[PDB]
Amino acid sequence: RKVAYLTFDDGPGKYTAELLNTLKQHDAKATFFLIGANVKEFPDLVKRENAEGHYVGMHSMTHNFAKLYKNGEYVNEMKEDQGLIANIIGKSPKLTRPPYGSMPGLNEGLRNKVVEGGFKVWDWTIDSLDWRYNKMPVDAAAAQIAQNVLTNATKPQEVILMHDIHPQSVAAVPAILKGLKEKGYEFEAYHEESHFPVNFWHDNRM
Ligand SMILES: O=C(NO)c1cccc2ccccc12
Numbered sequence: 001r002k003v004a005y006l007t008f009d010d011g012p013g014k015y016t017a018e019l020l021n022t023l024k025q026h027d028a029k030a031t032f033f034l035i036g037a038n039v040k041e042f043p044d045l046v047k048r049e050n051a052e053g054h055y056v057g058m059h060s061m062t063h064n065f066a067k068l069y070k071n072g073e074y075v076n077e078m079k080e081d082q083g084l085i086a087n088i089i090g091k092s093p094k095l096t097r098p099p100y101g102s103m104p105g106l107n108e109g110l111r112n113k114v115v116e117g118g119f120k121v122w123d124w125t126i127d128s129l130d131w132r133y134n135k136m137p138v139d140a141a142a143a144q145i146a147q148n149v150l151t152n153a154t155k156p157q158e159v160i161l162m163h164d165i166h167p168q169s170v171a172a173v174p175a176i177l178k179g180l181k182e183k184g185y186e187f188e189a190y191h192e193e194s195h196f197p198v199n200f201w202h203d204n205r206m
């Protein structure tokens, strides 16, 4: 059993409905890490993500490196974001995705605060590099993003970093799905009851 975990950061946004339709058309489930301001602007998309079998988790309020890590606001922001999501879907998610990744921002003390707050942390195993092709022609960029993902996929479990707020990322998803299905991956959402650690610190507590 090989499982691919597509994860989408920084939304919701104006390409998210299209992404959801694409995922549904391929019966794929994915994971979304949402920014609080966008949760407030797009509550219907938050509802739809959760209703259609995807995992909805937190990606902070400010996405501000200095505030989250140096000033130590990571857990406070994730808790605030958690509440905004819970207001819509009636569930308080536990999984967080650190802006800029956990390394080196989430130091010793912050990782303890995460655990003590009942949160988990997922980084990723495959970076799609989708930001490299920002503002480039969409279909060509998508093909390049798909090959970035497809070649890096080797392990039984892969967690793939993408951003649904960018057109070229959403456009890459059909080719990614096809390419990974051929290699025997199934596409699942994150599952709180089935947590396994995926973080740059190899901290098995989060
Ligand atoms: O937060 C991120 N993913 O959404 C993220 C991870 C790693 C590096 C970054 C650099 C600039 C902006 C964001 C990131």
Ligand SMILES: [Zn+2]
Binding pocket: 009, 010, 059, 063, 099, 100
């Ligand atoms: Zn981000």
